[PDB]
Amino acid sequence: ANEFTVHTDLSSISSTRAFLKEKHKAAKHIGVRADIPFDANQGIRLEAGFGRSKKNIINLETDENKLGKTKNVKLPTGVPENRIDLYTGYTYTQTLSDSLNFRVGAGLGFESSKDSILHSSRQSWLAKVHADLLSQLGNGWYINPWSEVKFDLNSRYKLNTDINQKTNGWGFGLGANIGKKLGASIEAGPFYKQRTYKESGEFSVSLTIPKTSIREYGLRVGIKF
Ligand SMILES: CCCCCCCC
Incomplete structure:
Protein backbone atom coordinates (compact mmCIF):
# COMPACT_ATOMS: atom_id res chain seq x y z
CA ALA A 1 0.00 0.00 0.00
CA ASN A 2 1.02 3.60 -0.70
CA GLU A 3 1.86 5.62 2.41
CA PHE A 4 1.81 9.41 2.68
CA THR A 5 2.91 11.44 5.70
CA VAL A 6 2.49 15.16 6.38
CA HIS A 7 4.53 16.24 9.38
CA THR A 8 5.63 19.29 11.35
CA ASP A 9 8.69 19.84 13.55
CA LEU A 10 9.43 21.94 16.59
CA SER A 11 13.18 22.15 17.09
CA SER A 12 16.18 23.82 18.67
CA ILE A 13 18.90 24.56 16.13
CA SER A 14 22.42 25.79 16.83
CA SER A 15 25.41 26.33 14.57
CA THR A 16 29.09 27.11 15.08
CA ARG A 17 31.38 28.79 12.57
CA ALA A 18 34.88 30.08 13.30
CA PHE A 19 34.68 32.02 16.59
CA LEU A 20 30.89 32.44 16.51
CA LYS A 21 27.68 30.62 17.42
CA GLU A 22 24.31 31.01 15.75
CA LYS A 23 21.28 30.15 17.88
CA HIS A 24 17.87 29.82 16.27
CA LYS A 25 14.47 30.78 17.64
CA ALA A 26 11.02 29.85 16.33
CA ALA A 27 12.52 27.00 14.30
CA LYS A 28 9.63 25.38 12.45
CA HIS A 29 9.41 22.94 9.54
CA ILE A 30 6.62 21.32 7.51
CA GLY A 31 7.20 18.38 5.20
CA VAL A 32 5.66 15.51 3.28
CA ARG A 33 6.81 12.00 2.48
CA ALA A 34 5.43 9.49 -0.03
CA ASP A 35 6.47 5.84 0.07
CA ILE A 36 5.17 4.11 -3.08
CA PRO A 37 5.50 0.32 -3.53
CA PHE A 38 6.04 -1.10 -6.99
CA ASP A 39 6.28 -4.73 -5.92
CA ALA A 40 6.31 -6.77 -2.70
CA ASN A 41 9.66 -5.22 -1.74
CA GLN A 42 10.76 -2.44 -4.09
CA GLY A 43 9.44 1.12 -4.00
CA ILE A 44 10.10 4.82 -4.41
CA ARG A 45 10.34 7.50 -1.71
CA LEU A 46 9.71 11.19 -2.35
CA GLU A 47 10.15 13.96 0.23
CA ALA A 48 9.66 17.74 0.26
CA GLY A 49 9.92 20.14 3.19
CA PHE A 50 10.11 23.82 4.10
CA GLY A 51 11.64 25.39 7.18
CA ARG A 52 12.07 28.80 8.79
CA SER A 53 13.72 30.33 11.86
CA LYS A 54 15.22 33.53 13.23
CA LYS A 55 18.79 33.46 14.42
CA ASN A 56 21.05 35.45 16.71
CA ILE A 57 24.77 35.51 16.01
CA ILE A 58 26.86 35.42 19.18
CA ASN A 59 30.46 35.07 20.30
CA LEU A 60 31.95 32.09 22.11
CA GLU A 61 32.44 32.68 25.86
CA THR A 62 35.81 33.70 27.31
CA ASP A 63 37.09 34.39 30.84
CA GLU A 64 38.29 37.81 29.64
CA ASN A 65 34.71 38.66 28.71
CA LYS A 66 33.32 37.35 32.02
CA LEU A 67 35.96 39.36 33.92
CA GLY A 68 35.17 42.75 32.36
CA LYS A 69 38.33 43.16 30.68
CA THR A 70 37.17 42.97 27.13
CA LYS A 71 33.82 43.55 25.47
CA ASN A 72 32.17 41.91 22.43
CA VAL A 73 31.06 44.12 19.55
CA LYS A 74 27.33 43.93 18.80
CA LEU A 75 26.31 41.27 16.29
CA PRO A 76 23.04 40.83 14.32
CA THR A 77 19.91 39.61 16.12
CA GLY A 78 16.67 38.15 14.72
CA VAL A 79 18.23 37.18 11.40
CA PRO A 80 15.59 35.38 9.31
CA GLU A 81 16.46 32.08 7.63
CA ASN A 82 14.50 29.89 5.19
CA ARG A 83 15.24 26.31 4.16
CA ILE A 84 13.91 23.81 1.67
CA ASP A 85 14.59 20.14 1.17
CA LEU A 86 13.71 17.66 -1.57
CA TYR A 87 14.42 13.97 -1.98
CA THR A 88 13.69 11.23 -4.50
CA GLY A 89 15.00 7.67 -4.02
CA TYR A 90 14.79 3.88 -4.41
CA THR A 91 13.60 1.77 -1.46
CA TYR A 92 13.64 -1.92 -0.60
CA THR A 93 11.50 -3.18 2.29
CA GLN A 94 11.26 -6.68 3.77
CA THR A 95 9.79 -8.48 6.74
CA LEU A 96 12.16 -9.47 9.55
CA SER A 97 9.25 -11.12 11.42
CA ASP A 98 5.44 -10.96 11.48
CA SER A 99 5.78 -7.77 13.57
CA LEU A 100 9.00 -6.19 12.26
CA ASN A 101 9.60 -4.51 8.88
CA PHE A 102 12.97 -3.17 7.71
CA ARG A 103 13.27 -0.52 5.03
CA VAL A 104 16.46 0.75 3.37
CA GLY A 105 16.82 3.32 0.58
CA ALA A 106 19.18 5.60 -1.32
CA GLY A 107 18.72 8.51 -3.70
CA LEU A 108 19.42 12.08 -4.68
CA GLY A 109 18.41 15.21 -2.80
CA PHE A 110 18.53 18.97 -2.73
CA GLU A 111 18.79 21.30 0.29
CA SER A 112 18.96 25.08 0.44
CA SER A 113 19.10 27.75 3.14
CA LYS A 114 19.09 31.54 2.81
CA ASP A 115 19.46 34.30 5.41
CA SER A 116 19.32 38.10 5.31
CA ILE A 117 21.47 40.56 7.27
CA LEU A 118 23.54 40.90 3.05
CA HIS A 119 22.30 37.50 1.83
CA SER A 120 24.08 34.24 2.44
CA SER A 121 22.90 31.07 0.74
CA ARG A 122 23.83 27.40 0.91
CA GLN A 123 22.58 25.20 -1.96
CA SER A 124 23.44 21.51 -1.87
CA TRP A 125 22.94 18.62 -4.27
CA LEU A 126 23.47 15.45 -2.27
CA ALA A 127 23.16 11.69 -2.08
CA LYS A 128 21.27 10.18 0.83
CA VAL A 129 20.94 6.70 2.33
CA HIS A 130 18.29 5.86 4.91
CA ALA A 131 17.12 2.91 7.01
CA ASP A 132 14.21 2.43 9.37
CA LEU A 133 12.59 -0.33 11.39
CA LEU A 134 8.83 -0.55 11.87
CA SER A 135 7.87 -2.64 14.91
CA GLN A 136 4.29 -3.46 15.90
CA LEU A 137 3.45 -3.05 19.59
CA GLY A 138 -0.12 -4.36 19.35
CA ASN A 139 -3.56 -2.75 19.36
CA GLY A 140 -2.53 -0.50 16.45
CA TRP A 141 0.48 0.94 18.30
CA TYR A 142 3.97 0.93 16.72
CA ILE A 143 7.52 2.25 17.12
CA ASN A 144 9.62 3.42 14.16
CA PRO A 145 13.33 4.07 14.77
CA TRP A 146 15.05 5.61 11.75
CA SER A 147 18.41 6.90 10.51
CA GLU A 148 19.69 8.72 7.42
CA VAL A 149 23.08 9.94 6.17
CA LYS A 150 23.72 12.65 3.56
CA PHE A 151 26.81 13.31 1.44
CA ASP A 152 27.22 16.45 -0.66
CA LEU A 153 28.01 15.96 -4.35
CA ASN A 154 28.01 19.71 -5.10
CA SER A 155 27.40 22.14 -2.26
CA ARG A 156 27.80 25.84 -2.91
CA TYR A 157 28.12 28.81 -0.58
CA LYS A 158 26.89 32.10 -1.98
CA LEU A 159 27.27 35.62 -0.63
CA ASN A 160 26.00 38.85 -2.20
CA THR A 161 29.27 40.68 -1.47
CA ASP A 162 29.70 38.21 -5.24
CA ILE A 163 30.97 34.95 -3.77
CA ASN A 164 30.06 31.47 -4.98
CA GLN A 165 32.32 28.71 -3.71
CA LYS A 166 32.00 24.93 -3.31
CA THR A 167 31.70 23.69 0.28
CA ASN A 168 30.93 19.94 0.20
CA GLY A 169 30.02 18.22 3.46
CA TRP A 170 27.83 15.57 5.01
CA GLY A 171 25.17 15.04 7.65
CA PHE A 172 23.23 12.40 9.55
CA GLY A 173 19.89 12.15 11.33
CA LEU A 174 18.44 9.74 13.88
CA GLY A 175 15.03 9.50 15.53
CA ALA A 176 12.11 7.30 16.54
CA ASN A 177 8.40 7.79 16.07
CA ILE A 178 5.72 6.26 18.26
CA GLY A 179 2.45 5.95 16.37
CA LYS A 180 -1.14 4.77 16.66
CA LYS A 181 -3.65 3.75 14.00
CA LEU A 182 -6.81 5.84 14.11
CA GLY A 183 -8.98 3.27 12.33
CA ALA A 184 -4.86 6.88 9.14
CA SER A 185 -2.22 7.01 11.88
CA ILE A 186 -0.85 9.75 14.15
CA GLU A 187 2.81 9.63 15.21
CA ALA A 188 5.25 11.70 17.24
CA GLY A 189 8.84 11.43 18.41
CA PRO A 190 12.26 12.99 18.99
CA PHE A 191 15.00 13.39 16.41
CA TYR A 192 18.59 14.55 16.22
CA LYS A 193 20.30 15.95 13.12
CA GLN A 194 23.86 17.12 12.48
CA ARG A 195 25.24 18.76 9.33
CA THR A 196 28.85 19.71 8.59
CA TYR A 197 30.16 21.80 5.69
CA LYS A 198 33.94 21.77 5.25
CA GLU A 199 36.15 24.83 5.00
CA SER A 200 36.38 25.73 1.34
CA GLY A 201 39.61 25.75 -0.65
CA GLU A 202 41.46 29.06 -0.94
CA PHE A 203 39.93 31.50 -3.39
CA SER A 204 40.73 35.09 -4.34
CA VAL A 205 42.11 39.17 -1.10
CA LEU A 219 10.08 16.73 18.13
CA ARG A 220 8.26 15.72 14.96
CA VAL A 221 4.52 15.04 14.74
CA GLY A 222 2.89 13.50 11.67
CA ILE A 223 -0.30 12.20 10.14
CA LYS A 224 0.19 9.06 8.11
CA PHE A 225 -2.52 8.45 5.52
C1 LIG B 1 16.61 6.19 18.50
C2 LIG B 1 17.17 7.57 18.25
C3 LIG B 1 16.35 8.61 19.00
C4 LIG B 1 16.89 10.02 18.77
C5 LIG B 1 17.23 10.73 20.08
C6 LIG B 1 17.57 12.19 19.82
C7 LIG B 1 17.74 12.95 21.14
C8 LIG B 1 16.61 13.93 21.36
Whole structure:
Protein backbone atom coordinates (compact mmCIF):
# COMPACT_ATOMS: atom_id res chain seq x y z
CA ALA A 1 0.00 0.00 0.00
CA ASN A 2 1.02 3.60 -0.70
CA GLU A 3 1.86 5.62 2.41
CA PHE A 4 1.81 9.41 2.68
CA THR A 5 2.91 11.44 5.70
CA VAL A 6 2.49 15.16 6.38
CA HIS A 7 4.53 16.24 9.38
CA THR A 8 5.63 19.29 11.35
CA ASP A 9 8.69 19.84 13.55
CA LEU A 10 9.43 21.94 16.59
CA SER A 11 13.18 22.15 17.09
CA SER A 12 16.18 23.82 18.67
CA ILE A 13 18.90 24.56 16.13
CA SER A 14 22.42 25.79 16.83
CA SER A 15 25.41 26.33 14.57
CA THR A 16 29.09 27.11 15.08
CA ARG A 17 31.38 28.79 12.57
CA ALA A 18 34.88 30.08 13.30
CA PHE A 19 34.68 32.02 16.59
CA LEU A 20 30.89 32.44 16.51
CA LYS A 21 27.68 30.62 17.42
CA GLU A 22 24.31 31.01 15.75
CA LYS A 23 21.28 30.15 17.88
CA HIS A 24 17.87 29.82 16.27
CA LYS A 25 14.47 30.78 17.64
CA ALA A 26 11.02 29.85 16.33
CA ALA A 27 12.52 27.00 14.30
CA LYS A 28 9.63 25.38 12.45
CA HIS A 29 9.41 22.94 9.54
CA ILE A 30 6.62 21.32 7.51
CA GLY A 31 7.20 18.38 5.20
CA VAL A 32 5.66 15.51 3.28
CA ARG A 33 6.81 12.00 2.48
CA ALA A 34 5.43 9.49 -0.03
CA ASP A 35 6.47 5.84 0.07
CA ILE A 36 5.17 4.11 -3.08
CA PRO A 37 5.50 0.32 -3.53
CA PHE A 38 6.04 -1.10 -6.99
CA ASP A 39 6.28 -4.73 -5.92
CA ALA A 40 6.31 -6.77 -2.70
CA ASN A 41 9.66 -5.22 -1.74
CA GLN A 42 10.76 -2.44 -4.09
CA GLY A 43 9.44 1.12 -4.00
CA ILE A 44 10.10 4.82 -4.41
CA ARG A 45 10.34 7.50 -1.71
CA LEU A 46 9.71 11.19 -2.35
CA GLU A 47 10.15 13.96 0.23
CA ALA A 48 9.66 17.74 0.26
CA GLY A 49 9.92 20.14 3.19
CA PHE A 50 10.11 23.82 4.10
CA GLY A 51 11.64 25.39 7.18
CA ARG A 52 12.07 28.80 8.79
CA SER A 53 13.72 30.33 11.86
CA LYS A 54 15.22 33.53 13.23
CA LYS A 55 18.79 33.46 14.42
CA ASN A 56 21.05 35.45 16.71
CA ILE A 57 24.77 35.51 16.01
CA ILE A 58 26.86 35.42 19.18
CA ASN A 59 30.46 35.07 20.30
CA LEU A 60 31.95 32.09 22.11
CA GLU A 61 32.44 32.68 25.86
CA THR A 62 35.81 33.70 27.31
CA ASP A 63 37.09 34.39 30.84
CA GLU A 64 38.29 37.81 29.64
CA ASN A 65 34.71 38.66 28.71
CA LYS A 66 33.32 37.35 32.02
CA LEU A 67 35.96 39.36 33.92
CA GLY A 68 35.17 42.75 32.36
CA LYS A 69 38.33 43.16 30.68
CA THR A 70 37.17 42.97 27.13
CA LYS A 71 33.82 43.55 25.47
CA ASN A 72 32.17 41.91 22.43
CA VAL A 73 31.06 44.12 19.55
CA LYS A 74 27.33 43.93 18.80
CA LEU A 75 26.31 41.27 16.29
CA PRO A 76 23.04 40.83 14.32
CA THR A 77 19.91 39.61 16.12
CA GLY A 78 16.67 38.15 14.72
CA VAL A 79 18.23 37.18 11.40
CA PRO A 80 15.59 35.38 9.31
CA GLU A 81 16.46 32.08 7.63
CA ASN A 82 14.50 29.89 5.19
CA ARG A 83 15.24 26.31 4.16
CA ILE A 84 13.91 23.81 1.67
CA ASP A 85 14.59 20.14 1.17
CA LEU A 86 13.71 17.66 -1.57
CA TYR A 87 14.42 13.97 -1.98
CA THR A 88 13.69 11.23 -4.50
CA GLY A 89 15.00 7.67 -4.02
CA TYR A 90 14.79 3.88 -4.41
CA THR A 91 13.60 1.77 -1.46
CA TYR A 92 13.64 -1.92 -0.60
CA THR A 93 11.50 -3.18 2.29
CA GLN A 94 11.26 -6.68 3.77
CA THR A 95 9.79 -8.48 6.74
CA LEU A 96 12.16 -9.47 9.55
CA SER A 97 9.25 -11.12 11.42
CA ASP A 98 5.44 -10.96 11.48
CA SER A 99 5.78 -7.77 13.57
CA LEU A 100 9.00 -6.19 12.26
CA ASN A 101 9.60 -4.51 8.88
CA PHE A 102 12.97 -3.17 7.71
CA ARG A 103 13.27 -0.52 5.03
CA VAL A 104 16.46 0.75 3.37
CA GLY A 105 16.82 3.32 0.58
CA ALA A 106 19.18 5.60 -1.32
CA GLY A 107 18.72 8.51 -3.70
CA LEU A 108 19.42 12.08 -4.68
CA GLY A 109 18.41 15.21 -2.80
CA PHE A 110 18.53 18.97 -2.73
CA GLU A 111 18.79 21.30 0.29
CA SER A 112 18.96 25.08 0.44
CA SER A 113 19.10 27.75 3.14
CA LYS A 114 19.09 31.54 2.81
CA ASP A 115 19.46 34.30 5.41
CA SER A 116 19.32 38.10 5.31
CA ILE A 117 21.47 40.56 7.27
CA LEU A 118 23.54 40.90 3.05
CA HIS A 119 22.30 37.50 1.83
CA SER A 120 24.08 34.24 2.44
CA SER A 121 22.90 31.07 0.74
CA ARG A 122 23.83 27.40 0.91
CA GLN A 123 22.58 25.20 -1.96
CA SER A 124 23.44 21.51 -1.87
CA TRP A 125 22.94 18.62 -4.27
CA LEU A 126 23.47 15.45 -2.27
CA ALA A 127 23.16 11.69 -2.08
CA LYS A 128 21.27 10.18 0.83
CA VAL A 129 20.94 6.70 2.33
CA HIS A 130 18.29 5.86 4.91
CA ALA A 131 17.12 2.91 7.01
CA ASP A 132 14.21 2.43 9.37
CA LEU A 133 12.59 -0.33 11.39
CA LEU A 134 8.83 -0.55 11.87
CA SER A 135 7.87 -2.64 14.91
CA GLN A 136 4.29 -3.46 15.90
CA LEU A 137 3.45 -3.05 19.59
CA GLY A 138 -0.12 -4.36 19.35
CA ASN A 139 -3.56 -2.75 19.36
CA GLY A 140 -2.53 -0.50 16.45
CA TRP A 141 0.48 0.94 18.30
CA TYR A 142 3.97 0.93 16.72
CA ILE A 143 7.52 2.25 17.12
CA ASN A 144 9.62 3.42 14.16
CA PRO A 145 13.33 4.07 14.77
CA TRP A 146 15.05 5.61 11.75
CA SER A 147 18.41 6.90 10.51
CA GLU A 148 19.69 8.72 7.42
CA VAL A 149 23.08 9.94 6.17
CA LYS A 150 23.72 12.65 3.56
CA PHE A 151 26.81 13.31 1.44
CA ASP A 152 27.22 16.45 -0.66
CA LEU A 153 28.01 15.96 -4.35
CA ASN A 154 28.01 19.71 -5.10
CA SER A 155 27.40 22.14 -2.26
CA ARG A 156 27.80 25.84 -2.91
CA TYR A 157 28.12 28.81 -0.58
CA LYS A 158 26.89 32.10 -1.98
CA LEU A 159 27.27 35.62 -0.63
CA ASN A 160 26.00 38.85 -2.20
CA THR A 161 29.27 40.68 -1.47
CA ASP A 162 29.70 38.21 -5.24
CA ILE A 163 30.97 34.95 -3.77
CA ASN A 164 30.06 31.47 -4.98
CA GLN A 165 32.32 28.71 -3.71
CA LYS A 166 32.00 24.93 -3.31
CA THR A 167 31.70 23.69 0.28
CA ASN A 168 30.93 19.94 0.20
CA GLY A 169 30.02 18.22 3.46
CA TRP A 170 27.83 15.57 5.01
CA GLY A 171 25.17 15.04 7.65
CA PHE A 172 23.23 12.40 9.55
CA GLY A 173 19.89 12.15 11.33
CA LEU A 174 18.44 9.74 13.88
CA GLY A 175 15.03 9.50 15.53
CA ALA A 176 12.11 7.30 16.54
CA ASN A 177 8.40 7.79 16.07
CA ILE A 178 5.72 6.26 18.26
CA GLY A 179 2.45 5.95 16.37
CA LYS A 180 -1.14 4.77 16.66
CA LYS A 181 -3.65 3.75 14.00
CA LEU A 182 -6.81 5.84 14.11
CA GLY A 183 -8.98 3.27 12.33
CA ALA A 184 -4.86 6.88 9.14
CA SER A 185 -2.22 7.01 11.88
CA ILE A 186 -0.85 9.75 14.15
CA GLU A 187 2.81 9.63 15.21
CA ALA A 188 5.25 11.70 17.24
CA GLY A 189 8.84 11.43 18.41
CA PRO A 190 12.26 12.99 18.99
CA PHE A 191 15.00 13.39 16.41
CA TYR A 192 18.59 14.55 16.22
CA LYS A 193 20.30 15.95 13.12
CA GLN A 194 23.86 17.12 12.48
CA ARG A 195 25.24 18.76 9.33
CA THR A 196 28.85 19.71 8.59
CA TYR A 197 30.16 21.80 5.69
CA LYS A 198 33.94 21.77 5.25
CA GLU A 199 36.15 24.83 5.00
CA SER A 200 36.38 25.73 1.34
CA GLY A 201 39.61 25.75 -0.65
CA GLU A 202 41.46 29.06 -0.94
CA PHE A 203 39.93 31.50 -3.39
CA SER A 204 40.73 35.09 -4.34
CA VAL A 205 42.11 39.17 -1.10
CA SER A 206 42.67 35.49 -0.36
CA LEU A 207 39.88 33.85 1.62
CA THR A 208 38.24 30.60 2.59
CA ILE A 209 34.68 29.92 3.69
CA PRO A 210 34.97 28.72 7.29
CA LYS A 211 33.89 25.24 8.36
CA THR A 212 30.27 25.25 9.55
CA SER A 213 28.59 22.73 11.89
CA ILE A 214 24.85 22.59 12.50
CA ARG A 215 23.12 20.59 15.26
CA GLU A 216 19.37 20.15 15.66
CA TYR A 217 17.19 18.56 18.36
CA GLY A 218 13.47 18.34 17.89
CA LEU A 219 10.08 16.73 18.13
CA ARG A 220 8.26 15.72 14.96
CA VAL A 221 4.52 15.04 14.74
CA GLY A 222 2.89 13.50 11.67
CA ILE A 223 -0.30 12.20 10.14
CA LYS A 224 0.19 9.06 8.11
CA PHE A 225 -2.52 8.45 5.52
C1 LIG B 1 16.61 6.19 18.50
C2 LIG B 1 17.17 7.57 18.25
C3 LIG B 1 16.35 8.61 19.00
C4 LIG B 1 16.89 10.02 18.77
C5 LIG B 1 17.23 10.73 20.08
C6 LIG B 1 17.57 12.19 19.82
C7 LIG B 1 17.74 12.95 21.14
C8 LIG B 1 16.61 13.93 21.36
